Amino acid sequence: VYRNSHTKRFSCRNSRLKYPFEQIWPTLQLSEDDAAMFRRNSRQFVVDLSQNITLKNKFALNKATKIPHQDARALIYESNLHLDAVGEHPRYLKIRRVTSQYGSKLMNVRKLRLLLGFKRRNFVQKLYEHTLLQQGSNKSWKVLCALEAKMNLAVTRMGVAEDVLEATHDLRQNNVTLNGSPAQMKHARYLEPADVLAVSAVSLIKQRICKGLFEVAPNTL
Interaction partner, residue 121 (another protein, K ion, none; CB < 5-8 Å by kind)? K ion
Q: Which one of 40, 69, 73, 121 is in contact with K ion (CB under 5 A)? A: 121
Determine if 18 is a binding residue for K ion (CB under 5 A). no
Residues 186-205 touching K ion, rule: CB under 5 A, are: none
For residue 170, which of 185, 155, 184 has the smallest C-alpha distance?
155
- The dihedral through the CA atoms of 70, 72, 77, 81 has a sign that is positive
Near another protein by CB under 8 A, which window of 93-101, 110-118, 127-135, 209-217?
A: 209-217
Question: Where is 197: in which H helix or E strand?
Answer: strand 197-199
Question: How near is the Cβ of 106 to K ion at its closest, in Å?
Answer: 11
Residue type, 142: K
Which C-beta is closer to another protein: that of 47 or that of 145? 145
For residue 128, state whether it binds another protein (rule: CB under 8 A). no
Question: Which partner, K ion, another protein, none, binds residue 88 by CB below 5 to 8 Å per kind?
Answer: none
Neighbouring-strand partners of residue 199: 176
Backbone angles phi, psi at 22, to 5 degrees: -140, 140
CB atoms near residue 161 (< 10 Å) = 21
The CB-of-82 to another protein minimum distance in angstroms stands at 22
Count of residues touching another protein (by CB under 8 A): 58
Which of the listed partners (another protein, K ion, none) does 209 bind, with a CB threshold of 5 to 8 Å by partner kind? another protein
Cα(119)–Cα(13) distance, rounded to whole angstroms?
A: 17
Q: Is 8 in the site for another protein (CB under 8 A)?
A: no
| Cβ atoms of residues 195 and 150 within 8 Å | no
Residue 167 CA to residue 163 CA, distance in Å, equals: 6
The window from 3-11, 101-109, 117-125, 131-139 that contacts K ion (CB under 5 A) reads: 117-125
Cα–Cα dist 86/81, whole Å: 5
Round to whole Å and give the CA distance between 180 and 94: 57
83 touching another protein, by CB under 8 A:
no
Interior angle at CA 162, CA 124 and CA 112, nearest 5: 15
What residues contact residue 122 under an 8 Å CB cut-off, 6+ apart?
none
Instruction: Select 116 or 161, whichever has its Cβ closest to another protein.
Output: 161
Q: Is 24 in the site for another protein (CB under 8 A)?
A: yes
Contact residues: another protein, CB under 8 A: 23-30, 35, 38-39, 41-42, 55-56, 59, 65-69, 72, 138, 140-141, 144, 148, 154, 156-162, 174, 177, 179-182, 193, 198-200, 202, 205-206, 208-209, 212-214, 216-217, 219-221
